[PDB]
Write a protein that binds this ligand. Sequence first.
Ligand SMILES: C[S@@+](CC[C@H](N)C(=O)[O-])C[C@H]1O[C@@H](n2cnc3c(N)ncnc32)[C@H](O)[C@@H]1O
Length: 325
Amino acid sequence: TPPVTLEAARDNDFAFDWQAYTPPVAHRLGVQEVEASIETLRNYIDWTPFFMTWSLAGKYPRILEDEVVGVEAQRLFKDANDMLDKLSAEKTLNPRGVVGLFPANRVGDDIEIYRDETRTHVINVSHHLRQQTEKTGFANYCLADFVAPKLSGKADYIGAFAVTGGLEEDALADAFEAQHDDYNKIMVKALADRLAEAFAEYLHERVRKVYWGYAPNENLSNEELIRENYQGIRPAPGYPACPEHTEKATIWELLEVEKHTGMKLTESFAMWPGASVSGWYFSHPDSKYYAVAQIQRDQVEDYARRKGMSVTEVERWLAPNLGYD
Ligand SMILES: C[S@@+](CC[C@H](N)C(=O)[O-])C[C@H]1O[C@@H](n2cnc3c(N)ncnc32)[C@H](O)[C@@H]1O
């Protein structure tokens, strides 16, 4: 579909009656360091991507009873759970995280994050991009649209998180590598990945039910969590609704991630440990995932101004989303 101007895209933002809506108030404002044991997180693992890493097709648990691949899948699952048992008993891989909730309001394509409920001084801005092609029967979506506009006067909130399977991932993998034990190197990295993703799932549930507290009586099974049968989203910088990786620096500052977890950002804004997830929390019932996709020079230049970057810098960080040479 052909591109639209930045102004035309913004004129087609997500349409919602903010005057009639009361955004749920975050129960626990502030930043809290968290941990979770392997024993806790293993009940939140989604095993299907684990088998994909091992090049096996099928959804868990049915894959275990498969007539062609089930026997190999059962051995992988047994070895994985034997390793989880050992890591758990020996405390050699320790998942850690941090969560924060803040007063927030939308201004334009950005979300202002306030020091306090006076909603005056801004401690950080979460910057977002907007879909920029012709939409038929849908808004030109921007994640900022799911937070009440400052002009509406409605008290709204935003969350953020960072979690890891554990800082020990590299030391455990590097030991297997030194032994030329490629099977167990792959296994421990795959388990750290499952633990990080399980922590992101568990912590999101904690936020919906307790920290934000808008769904205190939610009672979903793990299969229902995997199907995303809850209200709200947890979009992560680098993924299609917020592809720009440098926004992880804002999460790192907002949550003091390195102080609270030991997790670090690289010069490419990749996370360390490898088995890590970071992102935002949105409570709005209509919030959803989508792809920003290709954007034009007008939006690139505007994003650069908002970010305090040159156009040249932004063209590096937005290279995959540029709809022009
Ligand atoms: C990567 S899966 C994680 C849970 C899944 N059961 C698993 O283990 O792989 C889904 C997560 O990716 C992120 N995500 C997926 N699509 C996205 C999009 N279009 N924009 C932003 N984040 C997205 C969100 O953080 C979402 O919770």
